[model samples]
Target: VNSFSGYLKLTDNVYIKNADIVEEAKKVKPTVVVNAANVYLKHGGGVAGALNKATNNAMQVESDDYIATNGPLKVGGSCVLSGHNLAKHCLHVVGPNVNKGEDIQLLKSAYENFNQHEVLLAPLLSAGIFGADPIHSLRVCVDTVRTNVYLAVFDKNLYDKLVSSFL
Candidate 1:
């Protein structure tokens, strides 16, 4: 089969932000927005890929307070992930930098917040195909939120696998 072998078909409401993630967020109409910007790399994947792999979870595309941050040689203070300053509530996941269990801790923080019903609406995470694979990303993110957070996804199979364990 010489047809779209290397490419993964994007279905449902997958939003790959080339630059403006907020614009995409408005269109997605999600309860929350997650950022993988911090996870991207200069060439192939990115810090998002690394973070996803380490944490075994993808960033949410639609988060209420989540926002992507970028800068030169620094993970700026304005970066919500760094300051935990989200438009709503944030996950404060680690970058497009390097894995250090930072995102994992944030995942736990988000999960605890969800339990409080602070976030009645769950969010969708971004894909991690750049530096990693979807399964890897999903696995890390989901595992971080076991019984503590409610994970959601576009693909029924993925959604079930990612969030079902919690139920």
Candidate 2:
């Protein structure tokens, strides 16, 4: 239980943290970490971009190759890539676009598809650029996350929100 103070365990296997996803990925060293990826798998801004930068742009280079070969990831779809230095593999998942009515099910689908090794970790999917409501997605984040899961939340407001509600 005292493995890391930053992590607030939500279930036997799931925990949440208010911190940088990349930093947590460095510390936890899970078998597979996840990216809150775009359907096109562009490692642009937000979680994806930060990870791309952390891997010194190899993440983007690899992602670009993956998409070119396998095609754009569908909403609620996922694939794995080499983690470079963070983990054994990176799970790239495209969550639903709430603004476009992509809804929670698709978002749930994305999260559920993970193999987990099952030591998995991920950020708040679709709660950023894709605009899935954080509070709503929090439930999805909790219910569907796999073994030894960690949620790296970037916004202090959301961090406060989680601590306020669940802590």
Top-TM-score structure, candidate number: 2
lDDT of 1 by residue, 1-167 (tens): 11111212222212111223333233333334344444322212442333233322323332212433433222311123321222243333322222432333233333232333222213333343322334445444444433222233334565445444431
Give the whole-model CA lDDT for all candidates, comma-separated: 0.32, 0.80
Q: Model 2: per-residue lDDT, tens digit, 13-120?
A: 777778888988788677788888888888888888999899999999888888898899889988888988888899988898776788667878877866445667
lDDT of candidate 1?
A: 0.32
Candidate 2's displacement at residue 142, Å, is 1.9
Q: Identify the leading candidate in terms of lDDT.
A: 2
Check candidate 2 and list the clashing pairs: none
What is the RMSD of candidate 2?
A: 2.2
**The CA-based lDDT of model 2 is what?**
0.80
**Candidate 2, residue 153: CA error in Å?**
0.8
Model 1 TM-score, all chains together: 0.31
Deviating ranges (above 4 Å) for candidate 2: 1-5, 99-101
